[PDB]
């Protein structure tokens, strides 16, 4: 057996596009751009004494989308001003979209949950904004779909 290349193209971080309200975000941090995590488990399990197993689905799809930006980036001002604008007017929701380069994507509604701490030091600082998401289901954008009707059994 010979080793196989898992993809034809190369994963390019610059190809990952983040659209918050219809504008592309720029000025990201060094290591990680964005992290998406679900708040709660998908399926719960109830185990009886005799061994009977029953499960119930979870309808809580809220999640948190970390966003790292350099403190010198101009987008810090946009988010800071929008925070107070929403606080005064009362409108906090805005569309959020993420395009993957060689992975999953995301397209839902979101809001600003917490403002990151600010620290000034010898080197350029970093700010990790937290953006909520109404639904944290990562959707594919590939040829997937012809095999989902094959894995099905039982």
């Amino acid at each position: 057996n010979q080793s196989k290349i898992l993809t034809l193209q190369a994963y390019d971080p610059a190809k990952v596009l983040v659209f918050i309200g219809g504008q592309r975000v720029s000025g990201f941090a060094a290591d990680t751009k964005i992290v998406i995590t679900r708040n709660n488990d998908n399926i719960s399990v109830h185990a009886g004494v005799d061994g009977e197993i029953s499960n119930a689905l979870s309808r809580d799809n809220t999640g948190v989308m970390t966003l790292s930006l350099q403190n010198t980036a101009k987008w810090n001002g946009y988010l800071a001003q929008w925070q107070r604008q929403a606080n005064v007017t009362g409108l906090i929701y805005l569309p959020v979209q993420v395009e993957g380069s060689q992975g999953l994507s995301l397209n839902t509604i979101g809001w600003i949950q917490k403002q990151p701490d600010l620290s000034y030091g010898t080197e350029v600082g970093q700010m990790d904004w937290e953006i909520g998401v109404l639904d944290a289901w990562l959707s594919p954008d590939q040829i997937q779909g012809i095999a989902a009707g094959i894995t099905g059994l039982l």
Binding site: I146, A147, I150, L153, L154
Partner: protein
């Protein structure tokens, strides 16, 4: 297409619907000419009578008996043979005789009031009906009246009231007909025959073993419970050949064809539970009337008997001709069919997307999961398949599956592209048939028991 009312209601008085069940359709090989096809499927006796079948005719009796069971199916398959004539034998005794006869969509009920005199009177009465004479024929002889239809006409004769037999004669042999019947449709499981000659029964039994079907027959014979030394009945005939067929003695088996009751008590029973037929009640059958010795003889000959106990009726012992319980045979057939169906269904789905299966160690092992799904797991869930550790022999009953590797496959099979030597093992459960109890009664003061408080020792220490 056009509805005149936004909401409409059909008020059906009295009648009720019934749900759709899964079952195995039985087949009854009857002789008649009501339709050209070799085999047809009916869902109710109403449809059969609408096709020219006379009330009380063999097929009608079989269908009405089959549909009355607790596990009755919702379709019945009726075979067709040639027909030469029919007989109405009055041997015996009888006050009013009524015979239902239908001729070419014409329905009539001849009537009559020593057997030879009754037969002659009935024959004369039949000729009195001008319609019957023009399209049908009747002749008297001894204690039976022979009726034959004129060639372009179809006649059906069925029981009305009174005591007599109805026997149909046909030149076609069962052995010659069944190979043609199976060609039209293989979608049936139970096999039954109208002709009750020894040769026909033997032919049906031989055919069923070859084509993986279950054979049922009621013998109505009296030698069935003759002393054990009298090896002269059909039941003893089948034993010598080691054939499998659920045969039982009865009294109305040739006036009602009670195979329907057995099928209705067997059709909708899932073999996965291992649910034997020991005590299942069946409508239509009549209790066996012989004494203890006759029952012992019948059991020795493997002829099942319907017995009445504590006010009800109950089958007994569910044994087959070869001596093996019918339950085991049904379970084996169920496994054999469904393992194959599951594997084929997986293979077809896997090859319908491209990427068909290939003979390599990296793809073969999935058969383990494929087989552990469907039968091997449903059987465990429903209790048919046993599991656990045996304490006596110190062995485990866990189902096992083994798949050979590519290096062990001979080169010839890689050209034939067929795999062999897949092995599976199973342990079948068992129902409870008989129980024996030991009671005791005390009258005076029971004697004081021993007052030993030691933990009982297991075995004597003295051993060299």
């Amino acid at each position: 297409e056009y509805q005149d009312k936004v909401v409409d209601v059909e008020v059906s008085l009295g009648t009720q619907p019934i749900d759709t069940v899964g079952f195995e359709t039985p087949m009854f090989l009857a002789m008649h000419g009501n339709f050209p096809e070799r085999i047809r499927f009916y869902v109710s006796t109403a449809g059969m009578v609408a096709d020219g079948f006379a009330v009380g005719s063999p097929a009608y009796q079989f269908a009405t008996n089959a549909f009355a069971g607790n596990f009755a199916p919702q379709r019945v398959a009726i075979g067709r043979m040639s027909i030469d004539s029919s007989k109405v034998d009055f041997t015996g005794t009888t006050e009013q005789v009524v015979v239902n006869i239908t001729l070419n969509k014409v329905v009539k009920a001849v009537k009559i009031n020593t057997p030879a005199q009754i037969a002659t009177a009935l024959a004369d009465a039949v000729t009195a009906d001008a319609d019957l004479t023009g399209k049908a024929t009747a002749v008297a002889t001894g204690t039976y009246v022979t009726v034959t239809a004129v060639s372009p006409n179809v006649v059906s004769v069925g029981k009305g009231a009174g005591v007599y037999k109805i026997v149909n004669e046909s030149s076609e042999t069962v052995a010659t007909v069944l190979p043609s019947v199976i060609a039209e449709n293989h979608n049936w499981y139970f096999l039954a025959t109208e002709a009750r000659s020894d040769a026909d029964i033997v032919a049906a039994a031989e055919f069923a073993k070859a084509n993986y079907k279950l054979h049922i027959y009621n013998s109505t014979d009296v030698d069935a419970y003759a002393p054990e030394n009298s090896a002269a009945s059909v039941f003893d005939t089948l034993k010598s050949l080691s054939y499998d067929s659920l045969g039982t003695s009865d009294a109305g088996a040739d006036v009602d064809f009670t195979e329907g009751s057995v099928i209705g008590a067997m059709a909708a029973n899932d073999p996965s539970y291992g649910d034997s037929l020991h005590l299942k009640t069946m409508p239509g059958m009549v209790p066996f009337a012989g004494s203890d010795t006759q029952r012992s003889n019948a059991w020795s000959r493997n002829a099942n008997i319907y017995r009445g106990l504590y006010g009800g009726g109950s089958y007994i012992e569910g044994k087959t001709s070869s001596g093996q319980y019918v339950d085991v045979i049904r379970f084996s057939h169920w496994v054999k069919f469904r393992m194959e169906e599951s594997v084929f269904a997986y293979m077809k789905r896997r090859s319908d997307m491209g990427l068909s299966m290939k003979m390599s160690d990296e793809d073969l092992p999935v058969l383990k999961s494929v087989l552990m799904n469907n039968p091997i797991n449903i059987g465990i869930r429903n209790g048919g398949i046993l599991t656990g550790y045996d304490t006596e022999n110190k062995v485990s009953y866990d189902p096992t599956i083994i798949i050979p590797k590519r290096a062990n496959i001979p080169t010839n099979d890689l050209a034939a592209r067929i795999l062999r030597d897949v092995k599976v093992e199973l342990v079948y459960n068992n129902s409870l048939h008989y129980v024996k109890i030991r009671a005791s009664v005390v009258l005076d003061r029971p004697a004081g028991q021993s007052t030993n408080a030691q933990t009982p020792m297991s075995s004597s220490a003295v051993g060299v």
